[PDB]
Each structure stands twice: as structure tokens, then as C-alpha cells.
Assembly symmetry: D2
Homo-oligomer: 481 residues x 4
């Protein structure tokens, strides 16, 4: 009922106005503003019905309420603020939101204009999670931000650095027992870090990496007791990984003893092992891992990793485990120099080159799978041709996915390792390689082809100069092998 | 098995020794001390059986372990510490403790010598209630202190100021959600304040009063959700009351706006009302309440209290409510001067002296009850005489209790009020009093007698000089009434 | 040279622009922004000449620079900021400022618009007084604010609460050795409190009173070593006094143990005694001193004050000393009730009413002086009439000043004291009074007249209702005396 | 006067006792303890004469005073404490101390027993350098510790970690202006770090390295204004250097961006350049510099250093400058691998191997000097033989000093560099070397000899295993050169 709705908003806006006036005017007592406050509370509650029709979100904007509500977030009393937050949550709830086409956009825009996020942060900075009500408020705020994020992610960057990111770190860092709020915070932080480098940089600046390490480290020598705790842990790990997609952060991770903590996680063999592995991989990946690569060997990483290379936890699937391990190995071979490189190579000569044997075993495994996949793909293509279905970029994407699933990346890594290993002028290794290859009649040629293919697509999101360099380097392995 | 037990202690003490040695010696790695730690943990666990025979608490003292265990509270790693704490708890548990006669005393003495409490405090000061294990540790420590307190309360004073009291305040003050630990802390603090003035003084010094007020004030505009929360609230109130038994603390309470907070609690009419009333009473009681008395009237206390005097919450029993109200009134009449006294008196002239009528109604009610009680007592005495049972001090105590239950104190207060009221040179009041008295044929004489009796026993725990003064003052009321 | 000047501003504004651009663009190195910074520094220095012609302050506003400069206060590097501050100081310097008529107004307005003060505060909040350069910056900022204050004091209120006031308190409170900066801060704070109640309230809120007490208390048991230290002390005292002109602050002073500290200062007899006296007077003055009055007697103030009443430090002049003492006495007589009033009165009965004798001595002294002054005034009036000079409000003001100097206020106070004293139903006092009066043939009548006059002008800056009440009260003294 | 002296100590000890008693007993007022305090103060002052005869330091120990005085450091009031400190200073003053043989030892022992240092630290932790008196106290304490350190340096280790070291860092870190106290602190800290590894480790643990860097960095972009500031800077540098003698600290220095800060100091060319150079050298020296070596090249250290290698600041002497530069180069050649090694080598091929030319120039310079020195030494030896003076270890030490002064170390470094350079399989370099050598007829042989000599004495303070390894390595250079 549209006229009625309109009337109702004015019902609040005046109340909103007058009660402010009351606050301003008569000297500071309960009685002279007090009864206003109850009125305010109840109107807000009533308005919670308003979220059923977002066809009517052209309204709230319309004259006065948007700014007024925002202004109310700083109210001298928490119960107004929390009510406001609640309203926003109901009002902002995506799941009831995503129907309305104009209704969504305007409100969000208004919020952005009013720098809603900053106000929310400010409000938070005065809450007290001892008081159940207040605690609910925090949760509500978090929910609201999640909702906003889902609708329009361009505000993520200014949302963080409106102080939100700094608040999140503080809440994580707080020596409080685990509760839903912490989990929510973790979730939000993770979301904030999805594909956004500015946010990552901000986190790095704020000593966020240190915080992440510390929070994580609990699960080194303990083990989440619940789905909730576990979920939180996972979120944290994800956040860390996201942060690591950025070079500056490699160094921060290094400084914060990230490498040591992940190696301890591996040694411990608790649940965090898989995540730790992933983190390690992320730390080491490109040129920008070199220092991390070198340090890993220094802290005896080789002793932790090669057992994992050799046998994969009876108990994340096996492929993933293999993928990460091999990835790490590849990284090490790319980047390592001096004594650490020598150390690495030595692990390919013990014990009668058993690791080379392992590598070749792996290669055959992956190769067979790849072949199978390839055949299937070919068949599909043929079928498409028969049916006159044109193969476009979506089709190619789909095909790529299949290959990925079969293990393309792992295979590529293996091939790379093999190439680098046979370029070490260590006869024993080379002989073992070639011996093994013809002996079962797979061929150098296949390996070469694979290498070439890998080179072709290397470096997806980086300077063209880089790509050509890397490709060239990889090709150079083929000369002496 | 006693020899076996002996053997077992050495099994630990060496382990305790050697592992320290290990820690000292080989540069700081996991492996060189690490495996020791598991051994240490397990031995401690095993020892937890030892608490079945306290006939064997002459042992642990005996050679080495007591000091060693204490030293272990500061171990570089929390898991040792927590284990130790657990052991202590099992070891110290009263309920399994109070059988052994020598066994109890020695261990406790040893602990005292080693200033166990300080060490515990230190340990606490490095815990992290984010980690469930650590949180358990805190609880365990609290339990241990409770146990110790129950056995030998002479250590309370040095227990507090071994930093324990300061720690407790901090934990209460912490803006964390409510959990068992908070409740435990509250309980412990309350216990610490039982009949011990040094502790109270310490609390006052530490801004403890402020802390207590702040924690309390939540329940002004909210209302405990659980038995646990409610219990905590009650504990807090008790602590506050205990603190208030000491003059210096009156002033701190005043400064901290205690009076205002309790008046708001009264006005609010939530659960905290009864407790608030009690607190108010405690604030106002003697000469040392004068300032509080005067301030109460200043913040319009009279408006809050006289309604409670007039009608007692339909919904602590009625007698208690009446007792506290009348007590407050008595205090006010004793202490109030200047304009506030005038204000107070005015409340006895409206509306046609309705409050005097109320007072006389109350007096008759209490008087009848007292008479009934007295008759019963007389009967009992007679019976005793018949049976040849000699009435001793226990008997008199018992009799006193009966009188207390019937309402002696309230009656006394009422009488005092009546006397002071009729000494105000306000004819209207006096006429109302005397009119009422003969009209129903109870008598001035009875009232006088009551007053005399009150005077007789006044000031239980205070200077003899004071008592004689107060008594004299009270008698002086009888001249002109 | 006006065109040249114009050219010069553009010379900066571009540099200002481009260097920001540089900062924005090339990844964070010295070299790529670094050389810009030197250019920036030097241009600013050059501009320092610009403050010779404020006839050219219509310019800087004109296009770009005002906002740009403000924006530069938050520069990532302190040396820019400090340069900017320096420029502002040179640019804002009153003494070279107050000539230009339009030139002044526009710049100041611009600054206000840009909320210069907030920016300055922010800048301060990142300084480091270890570094001499930075320390100079603080001083410069202080100077600038002083300058601004002198020109347009309407910004004082938002200047404070732009955080400036809070910063000042922090700097005062800092446990650093005494230096010019502290002195400057003190000066500024004092200025801020001149005739501005909002500022006072803010100070009160911020625990400013406590800070002031603490800083002051050093000079209880020590004694400024330099004119600078002494000056600072004086400033602090002034600030305190200013704060005390506001009722809420009475209570804060009370709570902070201000009364105790001033009484200790009196007892100590160091330099701070005069200031302490003044502070005490300010605490006690009106109805709103009642509580302070009562507390003073409680902490044995009477023992400290009556010696000062009796003999005035051989060593602020004597009149001032007398004025303050008598003022305090008057306040006490106005406000005191109960036991404290009795105590006060007792000091007028010892020793054979020697204090009454003292009072009458004082009265005659002041009276003679007043008479002398009055005669002079009359003569002046006569002369004016002869010369045909019309007596207007300025003339009356001038005359009032003369009377004030002669001691009107003190005399009035004395008279008030006498009246209140003779209304105590203490025959001894009354007899002493009247005995003394006729014995030297001055007269009740004169005293009465004086009282009337006092009543006439009482309560200058307060509700008309209040004034009539107070006047009435004062008149009431005349009935029984 | 010995009996008199004895009497005097009792005069205090009772006063010391009784005043404590007074404090204990009568409720907390000025008057009841107050007058005691003045007595206490004056006796202490009087005792200050006692430091003229340390022949009488068998006394103060003797019965009571030592512990009493210590206990007085925690007195409820700073003026007692400061007096005590003053007494200690006078009492402990070395320069008046070092005569007495028994008198010194006993007092110091007593102090140690009473853990004087901890008490002093505690006292400090409650001071307030705003108050001139208090500030003097700090200085006095510092002086006392210096004195104690000079007499018996075995207490340094427990002196630090009695919290003294942590206090020192805090005081350095304090954002206060520069004053004598800071300088004193710097001096003390430096002393504490003289040849004591435990202290260094403690400093490292406490984030001391970070503190040192931060304090230092001021002088990157500024320049001490006074001898005092300069002195402080020097002290800081020394401390840093001392810290760097320990491997763990290399890593802390690295993490704290020490390398970057020293390179900026070099680039800046302010006074701190020499110190920075030294620091760099210390960071890079042995195997334990490898990481630092590698990082230095990463932050473009090569660009900063090789100019210094090439021409030595027109403006520490030239030899020292050369010594440090060459040292750094040597370190780099020892430790560098991978790409950084390549980079380093490239600097020996530009521009037509000008750096090789430079190196050979340097070598000849140093060689001539060495030869001169050697001749002198020979002459001296001959003279000794003639005179029948037996050459012992002192003589050899003396001779070594001469060689050091002439530049042995620098020469050795140069030789090492030459050897490593000619082992790079870079023909151009080798040809340049050998070309140059015979061309002026100095000889490979000499160089070889020098190398051998260097190897002989290498690794002074380290494992014998290490020494043999290093020596072997150095010899290995001689094969291919």
C-alpha cells in the first residue's frame, strides 16, 4: 500500500527530526528525550515490514530518510544504532533484494554517497561484545556488508580503508573465545580479498599477514573441534593464499616466519596439512618466490616435502596433493641457486635415484589419464561435427576444464622437473630418465611436446616481456635433453 | 600402594629435572626438548590418580616435587602449565580433600611457602582465552584458589595482592561475552571480600568500585537471560555490599555515581531492584553515610523511595523490602541536615500526613508479629524450665534469630523514625502520631521501651565511645516525645 | 610586484600538482618523487617573502593554492608539512597581518572553510618532538592558532573539538621535561577558555580538570625555577579558574580532590599560595559552591583560612589577599548548613570573639578608603558640572573602577559577613559588633546602606528570578540586625 | 672519626626503622609520618660526607643499613628514593672508590645480594622526568650503574634482565627531546654490550635492533647539532656493531631493514656515512652474513659501494675507509652465489676492468707500507738481539699492532679479492692481473705468501673445525691462480 507506505516514512522522519531537536535542547536528563527513544525504536521495528516490497525502494531515498538514518548510526545511545543496523540488514538482505531492478540500485548508491561503511565502522568501534544486544549488532553489520559486497563489489576497496579492514584484523586478533562473530569476520575478510590487489596491499601494510599467521598457528598444535572452527580456519587459509598472490606480500610472509609455520604444520600431520601445503606452493610460485624458495631449503623444507613426494597421505584428494607437491618442486628447480640447488639435486641421486623412479611413475600415471581425456575430447569434437554444432570459445573452455581435471597442470610440472633435472650435468639422472623412457616405450618426443605446450601458455596474467622470457628459458631446457 | 607411589614420584621428579636440563643445554629446537614434554605431560596425567589417597600427602612434599611443580608454572610452554594446574586442581580438590587430617595441612603450607598464588597469577597473565585449552586452565586455577580459600582463609589477604585481586578485576572488565569463566571470577572475588577489610581496601584502591558499578549497570537496562547471568549479577551485588561495609568505600561509591545508578535501577523496576535497594541501604547506614544521604536527596531519591515505602511490589520477600526501605528512612533521619532534612520532613506532611498513617500501619503490623514471637519464646522458656533444660548462650542466640525473623529490626527502625519525626516541632505530625496511638490503644510506653532496647544493643562492631554517644542521642529523642 | 607575485603562485601550484601526480604514479621509490620535494621546499621558503604585502592576500585564495596547501598538511612526509606550517605562521602572523583590511578576512575565511584547525591537529598527531625540526613544527602550529584566535575568536569553539583541546591536554599530561612547547600549549589552552563555556564543558568532559590538578600539584611541593615555569603555572591556574566559572565543573573539581590540593598549597606557604586562594574562592562562590563549601570544612579548611583572615602574609597585594579571604568567608556563611555551620560560627566565639574584632578592624580600614574615594568622585563630578562635561556611561564605568580599586567588593563582603554573623542568635557576637560600632561612632545605618547597595547589583550574569531571590535573602538579614 | 661514624649510622638506622613504623601505624595523614621524612632526608645528606673514607666501608654493611637502604628505594614517596639514589652515587663513585681495597668489595657484594639493580629499575619505573628532581634521580641511577659496571662487570648480565636493559630501550624509544639523560642511557647500553653475548641476545629478543635502527635513522636525513648528539649517535652505532657480533642478530638486522638504512646513509653522504659503512661490514662478515650479502646486492648496494671503492671521500681516516670497503668486497666474494655473484663479477669487467686497475693500485700502496713496517720490525729485532733483550709474547703483540696500523688486514683483504677474482674463469680479469703484476715486477709469489699467512690465522674466535675448513678453502684459491 503505497500512499500508506509514504505516510509511514514521514511518520519516522519527523520523529527522527524532533527527537534530535529534543536531544539538542533541554539539558541532559532521561525524561526530556527518553520517551522519544521508545517511539523511535518501535517505528524502526514497524519499518522492518517494508522490506517485502523493494518495488518501493525508490521511496526511502526520496526526500529525507537515507541521510537521517546514516546520521542515526552515530547516536549517543547504542540501542538506536543497533535498531538502525537491524533495519539496514532487513532492508539490505540480498535474498529478498535481488528481484527489484531499480529498487536495488538507488538505495545502494545512496549508501555509497553517505559512506555508509565508514559510519558502520565508527559504530562498531564503540560496541561492547559483553552485551548480547551489542554483539548482535556487530553480526548484523557484518551481514549488511556481505550483502552490499554481493550486490556491488566496486565498493570493496573503499569499504576496506574506510577502516573496515583494520577493524576486522582487530576483531580477529582479539584474545576472545571463538564465536559466530569471529567466523563472520573471517568470511568477510576472505571476500574482501577475492581478486583485489589494493585490499591485499592494505592488509600487508596493516601487519595483517602477522595476524593471519598467529591465528592460523593455533591449528598447528591443535585441531578444530567443530565445523564452525574448521570453516574459520579454512577461511583464514584462503585469505592468506589470496594475500600471497602479490609480490610485496611474499616478503611479508617470509619475515613473519610463514615458511616455518607451514613446515611445522606439515610435520605435525594434523588437518591443517593440506592448507599448509597450498600456502607453501603459493609462497614459492614464480620469480617472486626465489627468496622463499631459498629459505625453505634453509629451514630443512626438503626433509618435509620429499616424503610427501614419495608417498601421498593414505587419507583434499590425491591429485591435488600431487599437484601441489610437484608444483613446489618445479618452483624450487626454477628459482634455486648456490648450495640450496646442490642440496635439492642431491635428493635426486639418493638412493640409486629413487626419486627419479618416483617421478617417472608419476609421469606415466598422469600421461595415461591425459591420453584418455584427449581421446574423449576428440570423440566429442567428432560428434559435434556430425551434429553440425560449431565449436566456439565456450566449448574450448569446457575442454580445458576436462584436461585440468585429468591433471594437465601436474603433468606439465612433472615434465618441467624432468627437463630441469636432466640439465644438471648429472649423468646418473639422465641415464635413469632415458633408460626408463624407452624401456616402456613412451618417448622423449612426447615430453618435448608437453614442454612446448606448457611454454605456449605460460604466465597468464603478466607482462608480455616476461612471458617471452620465461618461454625462451623453458625452451632452452630442450637443447640438452 | 605406598612404595609404588614413592617410586612414581621419583619417576616424575627426575623427568622434571632432566627435561629442564635439556631445555637449558642444546640450542633452541623442537626435537632436543620436544619428546621430553610428552613424557612430562603423561606422568602428570598418571599422577591424577594420586588424589584418591590423601593419606599419602605427606609424600609429595617430602623430597623434591612441591617446589619443582611450582617452578613448572612458569614453563616456556602453556601445555606444561595447564597440566600442572589440572594436577593441582585434582590434588587440591576439597571434596576429596577434607578427610585427611595431616595430609591436607602440609601440602597447603608448602604451597603458601612457595607463594603458589603469585605463580598462578603470573601463569594466568600469559594465557589466551581464545584457545579452549588455555581457557580451561583459567577455570582450573580459579577452582584451585576456591579450594584453598575454603580450607585456609588466612591466605585470602596475601592471595589478593599477590595480584589475584587485580587480575580478577581485569577479567571482569574485559569486553568479552559472558562465559563460565566470568561467573567463576565473580564467585571468587565475592569470596575474597567476605569479612575481610584489607581486601576491600585493596579493591577500592584498584578502582574496583568503578568496575563493579560498570558491570552492574548493564542490568539497569537489561535483565539477565539465564540462571548463570543472574547468579553473576547477584555475586557482583554481594561484592559491592561487602565493599560498602567500609567507610573509605562509601566515598568511592559516591564518586563513582553509585547512588545515581541504584536510583535508576529502582526507577527501571527490573530484577536488579531488590539488590539496588540493599546497596542503597548499605551506602547510607551510619555516620559514614551522611554524604551519601545528602546526595541521594539531591538526585531526587525521595521520589523513588517513598512510593516503595507506601506500597510494596506486588511481586525477595515483603518483609525484606520493608526492612530495607525503613532502614534507609532511618538513616536519612539520623544524618540529614539543612534543606534536605526539610525536604524529607515535607514528605511527612503531604497529604494530610498520609506517610505517618502508613508508618503507623506498618508499626502495628510488625508489633503484632513481635508480640506473637515473644509469646512463643516465653512458652519455650517455660517448657525448658519444666524439663530442667538450662537456657545458655546458644538458646539466647536461637531466640534472637526468631525475633529477627519476626521483624525486630524493621520494628526498631519504625520506632526510630517515629521518634525522630515527633522531634521535628511539626505539630501536625505529633498529633497524628498520638491521635493514632491511643485511638487503637497501643501506647507511647511500648514505643519508648522498644527505643530503649534498640539503644541498648546499638553499634555492634564499633568503638565503645561511639556506642555510648549513639545511645545517648537516641535516648534524647525520648525527652520531647 | 603584482603580476610577478601571481606568476610565483602558479610556479608553486603546478609544482604542488605535479609532485602529487608523481607520488601517485611511479612505484614507491626515492628518486621518482624525491627531487620534486626539494623544489617544493624551496618554493615555500621563497613564498615566505609574500607576507610583506597583505594587500596581496586576495590572491592566494584566488584560484587554487588555499585548498592545495591544506591538503599538503597530510603529506606522506613531515618535512613538507613543517614547511607548510612555517608558511602559514609567516602568512598568518598578526603583527604583520592587522594592517590589511580585505586581505586578512578572506584568507581566514578560506582556512575556516578548509577546517584548517582539524588538519593541523592531524599533522600534530603524527609529529615526534625528539626531532628538533618536528618540535619547531608544533611550536609553529601553536603560534598559528594563537594568531587565528586573536583575529577571529568565533572559531575557538570548533577549533577546540576539532581535537585541538584534546591534543593540548595530552601534551600537557605528557611526562616530558619542561620546554617552550609546554608553555605555549598552556598559553593556548588558557586563551581557549577565555569567556567560552562550551570549551570549558568540553574540557570537563575530557577529564581536563584532573590533568590541570595533576600539573598544578607539582608546585605544591616545589616551586617554579624560572620565569617560564612560573608563567606556565600562572597560565594553568588561570585556566582552572576559567573552568570553575561553570557549575558542572565545580563537581568535577570536587571529585578530583581540588579542594584538598588547594588547602595543601595554602599550608605549604610556597608561591602557589595566592593562586590556590583564588582557586578556592572560585570553587566556593555561589549556590553552586555549597557542596565545595561543605567539603572544605570537612577537610579542615577552617584551620588554614582563619590564620590568613587574621594576619596577611608579610610578603599579589594585601587588598587582593583580604578580598579573597573575606569572599570565601562570605560564601561559607551563605551556603553552610548543619554541623559545618556550627563549626564556622564557633570560630567567631573564640577567643573572646577575636575574629569579630578582626572583622571590625577590617571594616573600618575599608570604610575609610571608600569614603576617601567617594569624596574624590564627588569632587570630580562637581568639576565636570563646572566644565559642562556631561556624565555618561563611560564616566560611570570609570567611577566604578575607582571604587573597585579602593575595595568596594571587600567592604561589601565584610558587611555581609557581619550581617550573617549577627543573625546567628549568638548574643556574644552581636554585643561585640554593636559595642564596637557606637564606641567609635560609625553606625549600623551605614552598614545597612552598604548591604542594600550590594543587594541592588547582585548576580550580574544570572536569571532575573535568581537575582530577586538573592536580593530578598540579603534584605532578610537586615530585619534582625 | 670512627666511633663517631658508627654512632652516625645508628642515628640513621633507627630513624629508618622508626619512620617505617610510623608509616605502618597511624592512619594515612601528612602530619604523623611527615616530620620524620625531613629528618630522614637530612641524615642522608649528612652521610654524603661519609664517602671521603672508604676505609670505613666495612661499616655500613655491618649491622643493618645495607638492606634498609635498599628497602627505602621502594618508599611510598619519590623524595626519599631520590635521596637514597644520590647517597648511592656518592657512596659508589668509583673515582673516590678505587683506593680502598676491602672497602670496595664488601659493599658491592652486599648490593649484589640485595639485587640493587632490580630495585633501582623498579624505582625508575615510577619516576617522572617532567619533575627536574626526578630527572636528576634517573641520571644518578645511571651513574651508579656505570660505577658498578666499571668495578665488577660480572653483574652486567643479571643487571640487564633485572629489567635494566628493557628500561633502557624504553627510554631511548621515548618520543622526548634530546637531553643528557638519553645520552647517559646510550652510554650505559653500549657498555652493557661490550663483549657480552647474553646481553646482545636479550637485546635482540626485546626488539632492541628495531629501536636502534629507528633512533639511528634520524641521522640519515639530519645531522647531529652538538657534540652531545653526535656522541649519542656514535654510542648507538657502537651498540649496533656489538649486537651484530652475533649470528642471530644478523637476521634481526636484516628483517629490520638495517641494510636499506645503511645504504641510504651512504647515499646521503652525511656524517653517519663512516658509521654506516662499519655497520654494513659487520652485517656481512662471515658465513653468517651470506643472506645479508645477497640482500645488499638486491637493494642495489653495488651502486653505492663501488664508487667508495674507486675514490675515497676527500674528507675516520682514509685507511679505515679503504679497510671497510675492501672488507665488504671480500665478504661478498666469499658468500655470494647465483645472479648476485654474476652481478658482482660484472663490476670487475666494466670499463676495461678499471676496478681491477684500482685494486692493483691499492695493493701496491698497501704492500709498500707493509714492507716499510716489516723492515722497521726487523731492525728493532736486531737491536733487541744486540742489547740482549729477549723477544717475548708482549713484543710479538707490539709488532702485530704495528703491522695492523700499517694496513695488514686491508692488504690481506685485497689479496683475497684478487685470488677470488682470478678464480672466476674470466680471462680478461686474469690477464689484467698478471699483466699488471710482472709489468711493475711485484710477483704472484708475494701474493701467494700473503694468502697463506692470512689462512694461517683465520677465524680467531671460532670452532677449530671451522678454521681448518676456511683455511682449506682459501688455499684452494691458489691452485688456479
Amino acid at each position: 500500500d503505497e500512499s500508506s507506505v509514504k505516510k509511514m516514512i514521514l511518520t519516522f522522519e519527523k520523529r527522527s527530526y524532533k527527537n534530535q531537536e529534543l536531544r539538542i535542547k533541554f539539558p541532559d536528563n532521561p525524561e526530556k528525550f527518553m520517551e522519544s527513544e521508545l517511539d523511535l525504536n518501535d517505528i524502526i521495528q514497524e519499518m522492518h515490514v517494508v522490506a517485502t516490497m523493494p518495488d518501493l525502494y525508490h521511496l526511502l531515498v526520496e526526500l529525507n530518510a537515507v541521510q537521517s538514518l546514516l546520521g542515526l548510526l552515530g547516536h549517543d545511545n547504542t540501542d538506536v544504532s543497533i535498531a538502525v543496523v537491524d533495519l539496514l540488514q532487513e532492508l539490505t538482505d540480498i535474498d529478498t533484494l535481488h528481484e527489484s531492478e531499480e529498487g536495488a540500485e538507488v538505495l545502494i548508491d545512496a549508501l555509497v554517497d553517505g559512506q555508509v561503511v565508514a559510519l558502520l565502522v565508527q559504530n562498531l568501534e564503540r560496541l561492547d561484545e559483553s552485551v548480547k544486544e551489542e554483539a548482535d549488532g556487530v553480526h548484523n553489520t557484518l551481514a549488511i556488508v556481505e550483502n552490499m559486497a554481493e550486490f556491488r563489489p566496486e565498493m570493496c576497496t573503499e569499504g576496506a580503508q574506510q577502516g573496515l579492514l583494520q577493524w576486522l584484523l582487530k576483531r580477529l586478533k582479539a584474545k576472545m573465545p571463538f564465536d559466530a562473530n569471529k567466523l563472520y569476520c573471517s568470511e568477510v575478510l576472505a571476500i574482501l580479498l577475492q581478486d583485489n590487489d589494493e585490499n591485499r596491499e592494505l592488509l600487508g601494510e596493516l601487519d595483517g599477514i602477522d595476524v593471519l599467521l598467529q591465528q592460523l598457528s593455533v591449528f598447528k598444535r591443535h585441531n578444530p573441534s567443530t565445523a564452525e572452527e574448521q570453516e574459520m580456519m579454512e577461511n583464514l587459509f584462503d585469505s592468506l593464499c589470496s594475500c600471497l598472490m602479490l609480490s610485496s606480500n611474499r616478503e611479508r610472509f617470509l619475515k613473519g616466519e610463514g615458511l616455518q609455520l607451514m613446515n611445522l604444520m606439515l610435520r605435525e600431520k594434523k588437518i591443517s596439512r593440506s592448507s599448509a601445503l597450498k600456502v607453501l606452493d603459493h609462497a614459492m610460485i614464480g620469480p617472486e618466490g626465489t627468496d622463499n624458495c631459498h629459505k625453505f631449503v634453509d629451514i630443512l623444507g626438503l626433509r618435509t616435502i620429499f616424503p610427501l613426494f614419495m608417498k601421498s597421505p593414505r587419507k583434499t584428494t590425491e591429485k591435488e596433493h600431487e599437484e601441489h607437491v610437484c608444483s613446489i618442486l618445479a618452483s624450487l628447480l626454477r628459482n634455486l641457486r648456490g648450495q640450496q640447488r646442490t642440496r635439492l639435486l642431491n635428493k635426486f641421486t639418493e638412493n640409486d635415484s629413487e626419486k627419479v623412479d618416483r617421478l617417472m611413475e608419476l609421469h606415466f600415471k598422469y600421461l595415461g589419464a591425459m591420453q584418455v581425456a584427449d581421446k574423449k575430447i576428440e570423440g566429442e569434437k567428432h560428434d559435434m561435427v556430425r551434429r553440425g554444432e560449431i565449436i566456439d570459445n565456450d566449448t574450448e573452455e569446457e575442454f580445458y576444464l576436462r584436461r585440468l581435471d585429468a591433471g594437465l597442470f601436474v603433468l606439465q610440472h612433472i615434465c618441467y622437473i624432468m627437463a630441469e633435472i636432466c640439465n644438471a650435468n648429472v649423468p646418473q639422472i639422465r641415464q635413469r630418465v632415458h633408460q626408463i623412457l624407452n624401456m616402456r616405450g613412451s618417448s622423449i618426443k612426447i615430453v618435448r611436446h608437453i614442454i612446448k605446450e606448457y611454454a605456449e601458455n605460460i604466465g597468464d596474467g603478466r607482462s608480455p616481456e616476461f612471458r617471452e622470457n620465461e618461454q625462451k628459458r623453458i625452451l632452452g631446457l630442450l637443447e640438452n635433453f
